[PDB]
Design a protein around this nucleic acid. Structure first.
Ligand SMILES: Nc1nc2c(ncn2[C@@H]2O[C@H](COP(=O)(O)OP(=O)(O)O)[C@@H](O)[C@H]2O)c(=O)[nH]1
Ligand SMILES: *C(=O)[C@@H](N)Cc1ccccc1
Lengths: 85, 383, 205, 82
RNA sequence: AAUUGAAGAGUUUGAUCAUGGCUCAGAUUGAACGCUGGCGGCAGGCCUAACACAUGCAAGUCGAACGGUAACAGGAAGAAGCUUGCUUCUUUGCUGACGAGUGGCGGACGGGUGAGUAAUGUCUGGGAAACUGCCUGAUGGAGGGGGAUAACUACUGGAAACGGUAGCUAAUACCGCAUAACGUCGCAAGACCAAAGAGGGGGACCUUCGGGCCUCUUGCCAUCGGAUGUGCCCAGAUGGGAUUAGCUAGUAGGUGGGGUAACGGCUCACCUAGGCGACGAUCCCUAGCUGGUCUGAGAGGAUGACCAGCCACACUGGAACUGAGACACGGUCCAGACUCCUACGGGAGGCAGCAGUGGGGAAUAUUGCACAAUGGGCGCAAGCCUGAUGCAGCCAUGCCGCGUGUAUGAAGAAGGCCUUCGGGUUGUAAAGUACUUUCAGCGGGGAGGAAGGGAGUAAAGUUAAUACCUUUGCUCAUUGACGUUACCCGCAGAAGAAGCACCGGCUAACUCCGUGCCAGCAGCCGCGGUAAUACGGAGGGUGCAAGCGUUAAUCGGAAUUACUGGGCGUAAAGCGCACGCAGGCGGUUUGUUAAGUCAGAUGUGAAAUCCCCGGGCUCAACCUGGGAACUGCAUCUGAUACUGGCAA
RNA sequence: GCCCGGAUAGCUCAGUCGGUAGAGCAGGGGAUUGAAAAUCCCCGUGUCCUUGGUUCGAUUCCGAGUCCGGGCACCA
């Protein structure tokens, strides 16, 4: 619309491209650990978590993730690696 | 809507009158085309005006004055629109074809404006590109001069401007040369008319419009008085006399702030619909004229060879009465002793109209009936 | 809002005097009283009970110059108070400022007294009042604006009140032309010739 | 963040301010938490013209409730020392 | 002081007493119609088409964030006239300030509508599996580097909208490195994660001459909090129809994975076959809820406009993004309908935001002024935006207040009218006469709504500091849309200001004349058939008053839905009879429990409204302090007569 | 504003192509009665919307205008 606050359109959409790109990369790491559980390598699964731990934690402080869901992945997946090992 | 209109150029209301196929419309678009190259606020297109059946009012202005042109219907079947078209004349332009010469109907166009009082006429002898023989142009010109001479006008002193509206509209300099000198005749033969601005306000209701989204915009050129946006002005018509207040005024889609005599403006009222107001009423000052159903007058009836009647009518005869914009008919009670009123009589008659409207003494008016003008006069008595 | 008509015609209806025409004279004596409420006034009424309830209200309401809608509100306030609802109506109707100045004698008649108030002439406690329906409070002093004192209307007016009863719920000075209001009006301190009992039953329905 | 503002009541041309404790995101004369004292700028030169309970203000200030500059001016206007 | 409160009449029949419907007497409304119309004060004002909309306006802001400055105003260098500093004036971001751009914040509030919604909502009272920007308390940190881009140049697509390519550069933009904790995961050991700098002032020192450094202010990150808001779950209450009786299958529940801030069929995979239903499911229709308003003695019934709290919608439908928060009125993407522009390839638009318009409709108004006050957003502040709000204009729509004059005045006139033609009546009514002057009209003084803010200045703290800054007094010029204000003084003349329904009974109040079951009146009973108090006119009179009546609507009367408070032999009404489940009710003695119940305490029952006592506008209407009330619910602690559960 | 349809006694219509306007349903006036019906005795009350013209002559010929209804516009 014809308002000076149409800035929020292009600006927030520019924010959409950035945030969306970061959200997929966070998820693909989780796909690695789920493949790790199906692979049966409890040591490699532990190693799988070794690269994604500083990932979601760095997303937590940015407000990108609600911080609660961040710790939630670190909970169940830990429960997964001890289920196999 | 927008664009505040400037009150700098003197405004003289003009207009081309003529006949069918003559070129009233052709010249209208051409004059603005000619004035287009002297000022970039003109050049009214041919499809802009449109035969022109409605009283089309476009404008053009020279670097000296401003003009409100009217493109009236030069047709006999559209005399009533022509009458109201002549309701804003400060000077006119007669379009006469040098091919079929001055027509008896074009002759009729002169007399209708005369009984309502046209001050000056700039006769544009049209269709000049049809013939270059000057003596043939002279006889057609002199016949128009003869026409105005026997019709109480300076036919011997009427400014005859030759020319063809055809190529003048095409942009041909030679024929555009006539149009430039045409404007020369308009500013000299027609001086600044009378505009009684300090008189009680009166504005004839000519046309009714409704701009979708803004309201009612009635129009007309003010005869006298001054109005301001916010002032309460009432309306007297054939219906019950009503009232309203001014909420705006834009001329030619250009804003104005004060209504004054001379300017053909479009005033904006306080939320009235279309079914209340119609052509014929009068926008005036609070409590000036009240309607009546009984009045007398002093009228004269002309001959049919000139344009009036030929046979004497009787009592009960019901002709339409016209005072600058009114078309109210009425039952006539003839004076005792005069059963038959022959063409040439200058008697009085008691009138009992059918739709009450502004009736006041000293009201110069004309009378018509059946398609012809029976005569004119002045309302001296109001019962 | 006022009557603005013949001040004796309505009084001839009731038969009882309403003091609308007291003036300098004591009693009229020439109005063909008690037997002429109008044209066919000689014939005595059927006197239905519904009418007699109306006859006391219309009698008393014209005494104070109050009108129906306003008189109904005095009643509305009368019911929400304590004591006697019948006597509540009496004190409030006397509570009007035009009524208290009427007992002082500063006004010959109430119609005279009403404009007296309405023309900024009365200045109670040093406060000018135009409202005749001003609810007078206990323990206060009413007075007259100096510009509007001894203006020929009050001259002949004060000597009239000498034959009046001059109630005990107030006191006039007439030396400085001032009025001091005492305690609230008692039922026995008023005329007591009217029957206000029927009025509370009138608005019962 | 809640604050101590002024709820402008009273009729046309003759107001009467009622100092309230309300939410910032709410309306002037709308939802609030509590009302404490009032403010009568058109009061007569008489007994009462301005009232306000200092303690309830301090209790809310203790959690972090801000005060409007006009309202905070009333604190100076009620003169805690005078 | 705080509910001191309840009326009936007419009409069935020849008459009566019942039963029983019908109608009127009351008050009110977001009103409308008709007639008339003086002003002021305080409110209200599109209920129908949630129908379609022109234009303007309704949300911007920070240089104390950054690169910059196209403009406006100066400094400064310079330059030209020529009065040699009086002017003209080309460069210059070095300043004041600053369009356009980046970025932070706001835009989720304020505002409007009631289409949808019968329970996802709302109200009432509890509850736990959460989140929480701006604000604020507590405790530490605030170390060090890198890579792009907009604006801007060059070129260029397209009518425009709106882009495209290659290069330019900064940051409180983005992305790392380091450091990690009472923070996160885990039994633990351990592992892992953050950030941003500017502005003012200034001494020594230092100055690659940008500045560091010191100090003050402010901002930044994380964590436990708190205040507040929001989300979620349960219980009770929240309409009509049974001529709607079976419904449901991600549906009832469980295990596991995922998702959500959080819990869960929220969603999937397998398994189980159940869950809802007469104290009414589903289905159909209708409808925003409540606080309240009107009526009512109360209980109830009706209703939900305005002020206020909540929910939902935003052209129709749908999805999602950003962010603390929307799944969003003045944001986006898609399809559809309706408008518009067009250079026909393709785009623009949403008034149920103020006004305003066509149309609908019986019917509801201005395209005003201003940010002076309160509130909101950004900002250090100054200010700026603010159709919130504050006021003004139109309308008798409501309530309240007031005026259209007072006193005197008998030939007891004129005229109208009636008449037993005697006279009566209009009627102190008028003229006449002596006075007054509100409000209107006009002319001058003159409140209050205004608290603050800016500059200057002293003192007290901060600090190396008499500086900056912060705080408290004081001084100066002051900030008012309304506004020819409120209010007051004064001048002129009774001067400018009364109508409307009704008059047989119900129901306060009559005759005459004219029309003859004709015309008409009318709430019901009924009037008029040639002597009408009911039709029409005139006079008189009654009621009310800038309003008066008609009409529509709700309640009252209606104890004609009876809970308080009705009936059934014949007036409306005992199933034809009987058995019997669910349900209702249940002798008497004792013990016991303490659910119903009772008393008391506690939390809650928002505010305004209604009630009592006071206060402020001349009074009132209206506004308003305090108290009371809010007749209900939840929990705790006692009591044991009655009812209920258990046992004899 | 433009273009048409109805405008015919109380009501609905016939009758035109210039030659002195009809019918039906009505309704009403009288004799009889307390008053009507039934019965009997009599019946047209019309500016053809109005007005003007080509006239020995116009409802019918050409037209304006007013009233009402039905379609199109125009957009200061
Ligand atoms: N030769 C010539 N023809 C003309 C002239 N004016 C008009 N016309 C023609 O007449 C026709 C109609 O012209 P118009 O202006 O519509 O006339 P109106 O509307 O009756 O005024 C057009 O087609 C022109 O060609 C003229 O001056 N000369
Ligand atoms: C509106 O434009 C008026 N000022 C002029 C006008 C034009 C056409 C018809 C009537 C008036």
């Amino acid at each position: 619309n014809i308002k000076s606050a149409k800035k929020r359109a292009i600006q927030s959409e520019k924010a959409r491209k950035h945030n969306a790109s970061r959200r997929s990369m966070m998820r693909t790491f989780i796909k690695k650990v789920y493949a790790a559980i199906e692979a049966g390598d409890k040591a490699a699964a532990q190693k799988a978590f070794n690269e994604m731990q500083p990932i979601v934690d760095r997303q937590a402080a940015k407000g990108l993730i609600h911080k609660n869901k961040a710790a939630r992945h670190k909970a169940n997946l830990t429960a997964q690696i001890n289920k196999l090992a | 809507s927008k664009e505040k209109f400037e009150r700098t150029k003197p405004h003289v209301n003009v207009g081309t009158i003529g006949h069918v196929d003559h070129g009233k419309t052709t010249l209208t678009a051409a004059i603005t085309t000619v004035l287009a190259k002297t000022y970039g606020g003109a050049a009214r297109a041919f499809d802009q005006i449109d035969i022109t059946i409605n009283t089309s009012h476009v404008e053009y202005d020279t670097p000296t004055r401003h003009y409100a042109h009217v493109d009236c219907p030069g047709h006999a079947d559209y005399v009533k629109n022509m009458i109201t078209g002549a309701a804003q004349m400060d000077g006119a332009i007669l379009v006469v074809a040098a091919t079929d010469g001055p027509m008896p109907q074009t002759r009729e166009h002169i007399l209708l404006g005369r009984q309502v009082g046209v001050p000056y006429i700039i006769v544009f002898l049209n269709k000049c590109d049809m013939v270059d023989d000057e003596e043939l142009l002279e006889l057609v010109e002199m016949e128009v001069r003869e026409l105005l001479s026997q019709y109480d006008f300076p036919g011997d002193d009427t400014p005859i401007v030759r020319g063809s509206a055809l190529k003048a509209l095409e942009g041909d300099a030679e024929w555009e040369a006539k149009i430039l000198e045409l404007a020369g005749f308009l500013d000299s033969y027609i001086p600044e008319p009378e505009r009684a601005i300090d008189k009680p306000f009166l504005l004839p209701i000519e046309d009714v419009f409704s701009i979708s989204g803004r309201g009612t915009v009635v129009t007309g050129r003010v005869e006298r008085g001054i109005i301001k946006v916010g002032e309460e002005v009432e309306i007297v018509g054939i219906k019950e006399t009503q009232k309203s207040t001014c909420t705006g005024v834009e001329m030619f889609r250009k804003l104005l702030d004060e209504g004054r005599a001379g300017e053909n403006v479009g005033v904006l009222l306080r939320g009235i619909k279309r079914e209340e107001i119609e052509r014929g009423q009068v926008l005036a000052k609070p409590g000036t004229i009240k309607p009546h159903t009984k009045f007398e007058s002093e009228v004269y009836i002309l001959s049919k060879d000139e344009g009036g009647r030929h046979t004497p009518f009787f009592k009960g005869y019901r002709p339409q009465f016209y005072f600058r914009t009114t078309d109210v008919t009425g039952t006539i009670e003839l004076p005792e002793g005069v059963e038959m009123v022959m063409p040439g009589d200058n008697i009085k008659m008691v009138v009992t109209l059918i739709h009450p409207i502004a009736m006041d003494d000293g009201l110069r008016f004309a009378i018509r009936e059946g398609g012809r003008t029976v005569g004119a006069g002045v309302v001296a008595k109001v019962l | 809002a006022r009557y603005l008509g013949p001040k004796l015609k309505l009084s001839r209806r009731e038969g009882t005097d309403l003091f609308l025409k007291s003036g300098v004279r004591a009693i009229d004596t020439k109005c063909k009283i008690e037997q002429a409420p109008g044209q066919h006034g000689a014939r005595k009424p059927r006197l239905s009970d519904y009418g007699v309830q109306l006859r006391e209200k219309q009698k008393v309401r014209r005494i104070y110059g109050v009108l129906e809608r306003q008189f109904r509100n005095y009643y509305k306030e009368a019911a929400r108070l304590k004591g006697n609802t019948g006597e509540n109506l009496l004190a409030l109707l006397e509570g009007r400022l035009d009524n208290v100045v009427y007992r002082m004698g500063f006004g010959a008649t109430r119609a005279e007294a009403r404009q007296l108030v309405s023309h900024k002439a009365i200045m109670v406690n040093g406060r000018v009042v135009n409202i005749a329906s001003y609810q007078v409070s206990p323990n206060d002093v009413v007075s007259i604006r100096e510009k509007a004192k001894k203006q020929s209307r009050v001259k002949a007016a004060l000597e009239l009140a000498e034959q009046r009863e001059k109630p005990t719920w107030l006191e006039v000075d007439a030396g400085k032309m001032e009025g001091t209001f005492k305690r609230k009006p008692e039922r026995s301190d008023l005329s007591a010739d009217i029957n206000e009992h029927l009025i509370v039953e009138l608005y019962s329905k | 963040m809640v604050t101590i503002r002024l709820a402008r009541h009273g009729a046309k041309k003759r107001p009467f301010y009622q100092v309230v404790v309300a939410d910032s995101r709410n309306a002037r004369n709308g939802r609030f938490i509590e009302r404490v004292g009032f403010f009568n700028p058109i009061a007569s030169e008489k007994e009462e013209g301005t009232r306000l309970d200092l303690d309830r203000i301090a209790h809310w200030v203790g959690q972090g409730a801000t005060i409007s500059d006009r309202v905070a001016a009333l604190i100076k206007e009620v003169n805690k020392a005078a």
